[PDB]
Design a binder for this molecule. Sequence first.
Ligand SMILES: Brc1ccc([C@H]2C3=C(N=C4NC=NN42)c2ccccc2O[C@@H]3c2ccc(Br)cc2)cc1
Length: 93
Amino acid sequence: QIPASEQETLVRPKPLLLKLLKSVGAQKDTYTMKEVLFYLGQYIMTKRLYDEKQQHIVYCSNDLLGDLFGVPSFSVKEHRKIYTMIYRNLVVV
Ligand SMILES: Brc1ccc([C@H]2C3=C(N=C4NC=NN42)c2ccccc2O[C@@H]3c2ccc(Br)cc2)cc1
């Protein structure tokens, strides 16, 4: 539900939303929104932060991710929510 003209928004992550990204294979400092989302996706996948039965729900209560987003869990179905939650950990270049 996010226009493609918004996921290309050149952006760059703050100190540890960056740490989050490079810990899963990142090596740049300036990303586009979907690059960020793609890596955050790999991150959720690798630490298995999702509910094993209703896999559209993510648990980040006791994870770094939780500190970045400020919520204990969220649904990957609510794109806008995810974006604004990601926006606060980055400057829009
Ligand atoms: Br916004 C946004 C962009 C892409 C998705 C992806 C996606 C997942 N499941 C769907 N279903 C349709 N699209 N997606 C998905 C589910 C479990 C584990 C990793 C996943 O990786 C990502 C995703 C989800 C949350 C964040 Br934080 C970043 C990427 C979700 C929200």
